[PDB]
Ligand binder design. Structure first.
Ligand code: NA
Ligand code: NA
Ligand SMILES: [Zn+2]
Length: 198
């Protein structure tokens, strides 16, 4: 509802950027991605300096919306905020700081999550319905990037080893809470980069 309008605002801002500036902003995100450690358990603890850098990238709207995710099977369209934005994470999807920014490329693994969302917000609560072969799309600065689901893991909240950046791959993982028993777990739905469809 508010998400619908955040996405429209994002699109309007994008449509007003010159292609040159869109490309410059995207390239700056790719350059940052290249600086991240790879082949190791991710470090999701940023220093203040690193947070400053992170917050200044892909801030199209000035409200911290970097992109939006589309999941046709679920009818999903959701704005993706910086994961330091915090208040807004109770009602919107957050990119996990320290993971690759969602612009794709070899040697990237971006993580976007609804795990801090309020139960009533319904963020990614349907992703357990995704099967291997289903598609989702990140729309970032006028460019569309497509992922095909290839993995579905239910893990204890501490187990982030599968979120490591592989230098030969381009992955995006969608994350949500999955409550069962008297405890809380995490569902990680990974996709690998594939070409955009016609
Ligand atoms: Na890493
Ligand atoms: Na990266
Ligand atoms: Zn358990």
């Amino acid at each position: 509802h508010m998400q619908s309008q955040a996405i429209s605002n994002y699109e309007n801002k994008v449509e007003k950027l010159d292609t040159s500036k869109a490309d410059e902003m995207r390239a700056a995100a790719e350059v940052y991605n290249q600086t991240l450690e790879k082949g190791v358990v991710p470090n999701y603890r940023l220093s203040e300096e690193e947070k400053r850098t992170y917050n200044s990238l892909l801030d199209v709207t000035g409200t911290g919306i970097m992109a939006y995710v589309e999941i046709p099977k679920l009818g999903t369209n959701l704005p993706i905020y910086h994961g330091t934005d915090d208040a807004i994470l109770q009602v919107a999807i957050g990119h996990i700081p320290g993971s690759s920014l969602p612009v794709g490329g070899q040697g990237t693994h971006s993580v976007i999550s609804g795990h801090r969302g309020l139960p009533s917000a319904k963020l990614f609560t349907d992703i357990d319905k995704l099967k291997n072969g289903d598609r989702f799309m990140i729309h970032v600065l006028g460019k569309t990037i497509t992922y095909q689901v290839d993995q579905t893991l239910t893990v204890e909240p501490e187990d982030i080893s599968s979120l490591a950046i592989d230098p030969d791959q381009d992955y995006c993982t969608l994350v949500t809470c999955t409550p069962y028993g008297i405890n809380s777990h995490r569902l990680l739905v990974r996709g690998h980069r594939v070409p955009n469809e016609k």
